[PDB]
Amino acid sequence: RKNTMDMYRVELNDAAHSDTPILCLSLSPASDPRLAHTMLGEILNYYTHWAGSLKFTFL
Amino acid sequence: TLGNSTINSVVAYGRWPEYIAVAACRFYTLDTVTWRKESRGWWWKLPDALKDMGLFGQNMFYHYLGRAGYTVHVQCNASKFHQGALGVFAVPEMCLAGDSTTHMFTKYENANPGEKGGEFKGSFTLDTNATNPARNFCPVDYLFGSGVLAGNAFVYPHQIINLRTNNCATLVLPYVNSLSIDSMTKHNNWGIAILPLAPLDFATESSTEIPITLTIAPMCCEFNGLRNITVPRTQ
Amino acid sequence: TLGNSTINSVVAYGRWPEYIAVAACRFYTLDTVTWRKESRGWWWKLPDALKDMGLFGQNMFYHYLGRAGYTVHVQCNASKFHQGALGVFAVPEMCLAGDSTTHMFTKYENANPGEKGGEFKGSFTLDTNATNPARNFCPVDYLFGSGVLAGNAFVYPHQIINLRTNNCATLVLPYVNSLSIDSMTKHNNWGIAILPLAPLDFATESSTEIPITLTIAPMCCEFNGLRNITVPRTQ
Amino acid sequence: RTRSESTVESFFARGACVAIIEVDNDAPASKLFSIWKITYKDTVQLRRKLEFFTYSRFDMELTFVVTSNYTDANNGHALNQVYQIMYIPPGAPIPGKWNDYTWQTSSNPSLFYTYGAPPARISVPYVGIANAYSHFYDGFAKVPLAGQASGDSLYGAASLNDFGSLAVRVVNDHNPTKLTSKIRVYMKPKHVRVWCPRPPRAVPYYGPGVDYKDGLAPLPEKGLTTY
Amino acid sequence: RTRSESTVESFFARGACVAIIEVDNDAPASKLFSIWKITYKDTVQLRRKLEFFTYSRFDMELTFVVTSNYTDANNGHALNQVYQIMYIPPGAPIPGKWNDYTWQTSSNPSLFYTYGAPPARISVPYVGIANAYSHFYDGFAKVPLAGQASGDSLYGAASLNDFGSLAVRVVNDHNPTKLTSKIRVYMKPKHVRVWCPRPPRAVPYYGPGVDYKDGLAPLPEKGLTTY
Amino acid sequence: INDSFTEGGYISMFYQTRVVVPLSTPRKMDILGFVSACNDFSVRLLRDTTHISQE
Numbered sequence A: 001r002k003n004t005m006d007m008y009r010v011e012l013n014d015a016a017h018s019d020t021p022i023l024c025l026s027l028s029p030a031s032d033p034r035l036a037h038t039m040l041g042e043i044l045n046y047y048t049h050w051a052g053s054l055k056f057t058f059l
Numbered sequence B, C: 001t002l003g004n005s006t007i008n009s010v011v012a013y014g015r016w017p018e019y020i021a022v023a024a025c026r027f028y029t030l031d032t033v034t035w036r037k038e039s040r041g042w043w044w045k046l047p048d049a050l051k052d053m054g055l056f057g058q059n060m061f062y063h064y065l066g067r068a069g070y071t072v073h074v075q076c077n078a079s080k081f082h083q084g085a086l087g088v089f090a091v092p093e094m095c096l097a098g099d100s101t102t103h104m105f106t107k108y109e110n111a112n113p114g115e116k117g118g119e120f121k122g123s124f125t126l127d128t129n130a131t132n133p134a135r136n137f138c139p140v141d142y143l144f145g146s147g148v149l150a151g152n153a154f155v156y157p158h159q160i161i162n163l164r165t166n167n168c169a170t171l172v173l174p175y176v177n178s179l180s181i182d183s184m185t186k187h188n189n190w191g192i193a194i195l196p197l198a199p200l201d202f203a204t205e206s207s208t209e210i211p212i213t214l215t216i217a218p219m220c221c222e223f224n225g226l227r228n229i230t231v232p233r234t235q
Numbered sequence D, E: 001r002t003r004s005e006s007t008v009e010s011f012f013a014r015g016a017c018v019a020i021i022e023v024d025n026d027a028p029a030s031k032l033f034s035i036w037k038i039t040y041k042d043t044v045q046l047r048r049k050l051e052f053f054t055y056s057r058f059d060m061e062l063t064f065v066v067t068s069n070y071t072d073a074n075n076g077h078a079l080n081q082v083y084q085i086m087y088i089p090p091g092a093p094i095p096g097k098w099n100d101y102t103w104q105t106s107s108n109p110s111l112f113y114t115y116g117a118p119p120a121r122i123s124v125p126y127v128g129i130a131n132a133y134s135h136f137y138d139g140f141a142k143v144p145l146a147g148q149a150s151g152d153s154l155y156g157a158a159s160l161n162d163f164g165s166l167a168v169r170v171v172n173d174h175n176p177t178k179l180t181s182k183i184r185v186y187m188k189p190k191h192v193r194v195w196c197p198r199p200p201r202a203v204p205y206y207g208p209g210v211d212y213k214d215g216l217a218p219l220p221e222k223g224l225t226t227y
Numbered sequence F: 001i002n003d004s005f006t007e008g009g010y011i012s013m014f015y016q017t018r019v020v021v022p023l024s025t026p027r028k029m030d031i032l033g034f035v036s037a038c039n040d041f042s043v044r045l046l047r048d049t050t051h052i053s054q055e
C-alpha cells in the first residue's frame, strides 16, 4: 500500500464484534512515519520544539 | 461528557444524582453481549459490575462506605431491514430468585458476577445436586426473575430500544437506598435488566446476531472509611 | 493531622507545599530499620518509597503526571543513658554513584528499591562480574554517595536527632523540580539520607540496637493523565 | 564592604573553555570535518562551578578562538582559510561528508570565520524545554514495563539536556599542503538564576553523571592538636 | 506561547547557499571568468522552503563568501587577490573575455572584494516586473499559432523570473602560479509576503520545473496496528 | 524526533459495536484519517529538514 492511494484507506468490515484495534498510532507528529509527511508533520520537521493540542478527524 | 470520557435520556424518578472519587468516576465500557434470535435477556448489578474498573474499583474496595449514581448508555445498532425491540429496566433492589428448595441460598460469588452479569432463562429449572449445589440465580424472563410479571416491569425506570426508531438508550439513576450511604461490597443499589420485547429478525436469515454494548459512568461519588483493601472471596 | 492519620519541624527552603488525590495523601509508615553501632546510613527516594502505599500508589501508577510535597517524620527513641546522633537530609535530585566502570549503569529496579530503600557503605567496592553485572548503587557515606563531602551535606534541608536532646525529626519538603509536574514513575523528586554523625553507644554493651521508623505523608497532591495501569518491571 | 563580586552573575561572568574541536584542511587518516555535541561536561572547572546548584536559567555566550598550523616544514604556503561552524539542532540532518548538501545551511544557523580575525562570538537565550536546566536528574527516560524483554535507558540520561551539535569544517578547497586547526569554545552564562545549592564536587569526575572511581581520599593528614 | 518564530519572516530569515561560482587566476583549460544566472533552483533547501507557496514578494540580501587556494605545492607565493562581481541585468552586454571592455561597468552595479575581508554583502528590493514573484507558472511564453511550422516555447518558462547574471573575475593580473577561487552566494529574503500555500515537495527535484524522475517511493513501511 | 522522555502517547481505534449492513450492500468499506493542529499550537528553534536532500 505504501506510495499508492491505498495507503490512505483503512478498511472496515461487517464481521462480528471484536476487541482487536482497528488502528494504532504514536503521538509523535514529526517522527512517526504515518504523521511525518502530512502538512503538520512537514511543518514540524523544520522546527525542533513543538507544543499544543492536535485534531484527528475520521471520515 | 464526564471526565475524559465523551458520549432519549430518562432521569429515573425525575431526580438527578446529587451529593449528600472524582477522577475515578467516568464512563466504563463493559464486555459486549450478543443479541440472537433465541436470546432471553441479560442482567447486571451496580455497583457490582464496575468493581474492576480502574480507580473506581480501587475506591470501592479501599473504603467501608460508598455511594454513587449512574449514567447507563446501551448501544445497539442495526440496519433499516432489521426488526426487534429491547426493554432496558433499572430496578432498585433487584433481588433475583434462586434455584434451590432452600430459600435465599444463592452464594455471594454468583450474586456478584461482575461486568459479565447473567442471563435470563425461558423456564424455571430446579437444581437437584445436593452434594454440590450450584447456589446460583434462576431468573425466569416472563417472571422478571423475581416472581412478578415482566409486562409490569415498566413501572421501573426504563427505556425501549426499537430497532426501527433508535439504537441507544440512556438512563440516569440517582443513588437510591434506605440509607444515605452504605457498603458497596455488601449491597447492590441498582440492577439493570435487558429483555427482548420483540425478537430480533432479519430477512431470510436464521443466523443474524447483533452486539449490545453497555457504558456506565458513576456520578456524584462519595467514599468514606479508608482502611486496608477488601479482597472478596472468588469461586 | 493529615487525613485520618495523626502525629523541631523544618520547612525546606522556607516554602510550604502548594498546588500549581486527597484521601490517598496521608501518613504512611515504612518498614523500621535497626540502628546498630556499625551502621553506616540509610537512603530512600520519593515518590519511589510510597509506590505501594494504598491509594497513593494506585494514583501514581494510573496517571501519566503527578506532583506532591512531603512531610517526613523520623522517630527514634532511647534512654538517657544512650548516646548518638543522626543527620536526616532531604536532597533534591539525589543521584547516587554506581558500582561499575560503566557510567550510569545502575538499573531501574535497583534505583527504585521502594520502602526498604538502601544503605550506605563505608568504602567503595567496584563490581567486577562482567557476565552478570550487579548494576547497583555503591554510595559511600563520607562521599555522601555522590562524590561530595558528607560534612557539607548540611547545605541541604536537614534535621539532627541528638539522642540526649530529641527523639524525632520533621521535614516539610515542597515539590521541587525544573517542571511544574512530571512523571512520578520516571523521576524521583526527593531523596532522604540518614547518616550516623555520632555512633550509637550504650554503657558496657557492644550489642545495643535501636529502631528508626519513617512516616511520610504526601501533600498538595495532583495527578493528571488517567490511562491504563503502569506495571513497572521488577527483578 | 559590599558583596558585588559574589553575586551569582559575577561568579559566572567568565568565558570558560569547554571544547577543543580539531579539523584538518587536506586532500581527501585526516578529518575534514568534526562534530561536537554541545555540553559543559567535557571540562571540569565550569562544571564544578555550575554543580554548586541543582537548577539554573541563563543565556549563553559562545566565543570561538581559532588557531592553525602547517604540518610539515617548507612544504609550501597556504592562502587564508575560512571556517564554517554550523549549529545542528537535534533532529536536523548531520553532515556525513565535507561537501554534502547539509552545509547549504538554509535553516540551520551558521557562522563563517576568517582566520586572523578576532575570535568569533554569538549569543543564545535560555533554550531549555523545561522551566530550568537540570544539572542533576534522578530518574530515567524510559520506565521498563513488565512484559518487556531484558525500557533499558541509562540512569540520569534525559533529553532535557540535548541541545544539538556543532559541525565544523574548512570551507576552502584543500591546499597542496596539510593544515591543522583547533577551535576552542568558551562559554559564558549571562543573566543567571540558580536554585537548590549542593555541596561541591570533592573527587575527580567520572563520566557525565555523579559516578566516582578514583582519588577518593582527597583530604590530607593534620594532627588534631596542631595549629 | 507565541508564534514569533513561525512567522513567514522568521521562517525565511536565514542566509541559504544558492551557488558556488568557480574562477581561476592563471595565465591565459582554465576559466578566467564565470557567468552565473541568478536563481534559487540550483539548490534544494531554499527552493523547497519557498515552494510552500505560490506567490511571494520580498527584498533580497546577497552575501558572498570567497575562498581560494594554490593548485601546486611550493610552486611560489601570490599577492592578495581582488575579485570583481558585476551584475549583468538582462539585455546588458555579457563579457566574452577576462579583459573585455564590459568590465568598465559604467552603468552595471559592480562589487570589488579584497580577499581576507569579511564576506561581501549587498541588498536589492523587490524587482519583479509582475506584482509578485511566481514560483509556479502554468503556461507558455509563446502560444503556437496555426500556420506556424513545427511558437515552440518550453512549458512553464517565462521571462517573469529572468533577473540577469553575475560575472565574476579576478582583477589582479595573473600570477606566475595558478590559483583557484570559489565564491559561495547566500540568499536571505527580507520583508516577505507569501500567497497560496502548496504541499511541500515529496520527491527529488528534477530540473527547474515540477518534473520528477526518481525516488518516487518516499514513504517507509509501517504496520497499521503497530504504534 | 523520537525521544522517550518527550513521548506523546497512543491513539487507537476499536469497534464499540460492529458494523452492520443489510443485504445487497457492500460489506467492506474504507475510513480516512486527517490531522491538524489546534489554535494553541506553537513551534520553536528553526532547523533544516531531513525530508529533502541533494545528490
Ligand SMILES: CCCCCCCCCCCCC/C=C/[C@H](O)[C@H](N)CO
Residues within 6 Å of the ligand: D038, D039, D040, D056, D060, D062, D085, D086, D087, D109, D110, D111, D122, D124, D127, D133, D134, D135, D161, D163
Ligand atoms: C551558528 C554558529 C553556532 C551558534 C549556535 C550555538 C548553539 C546554540 C546553543 C545550544 C546550547 C544551549 C546552551 C547550553 C546550556 C547548558 O548545556 C545547560 N546548563 C545544560 O544543563
Ligand SMILES: CCCCCCCCCCCCC/C=C/[C@H](O)[C@H](N)CO
Residues within 6 Å of the ligand: E038, E039, E040, E056, E060, E062, E085, E086, E087, E109, E110, E111, E122, E124, E127, E133, E134, E135, E161, E163
Ligand atoms: C554589484 C554586485 C551584484 C549585486 C546585484 C545582485 C543582483 C540583483 C538581484 C537580482 C535577483 C533578484 C532576486 C531574485 C528573486 C527570486 O529569484 C524570485 N523568487 C524568483 O521567483
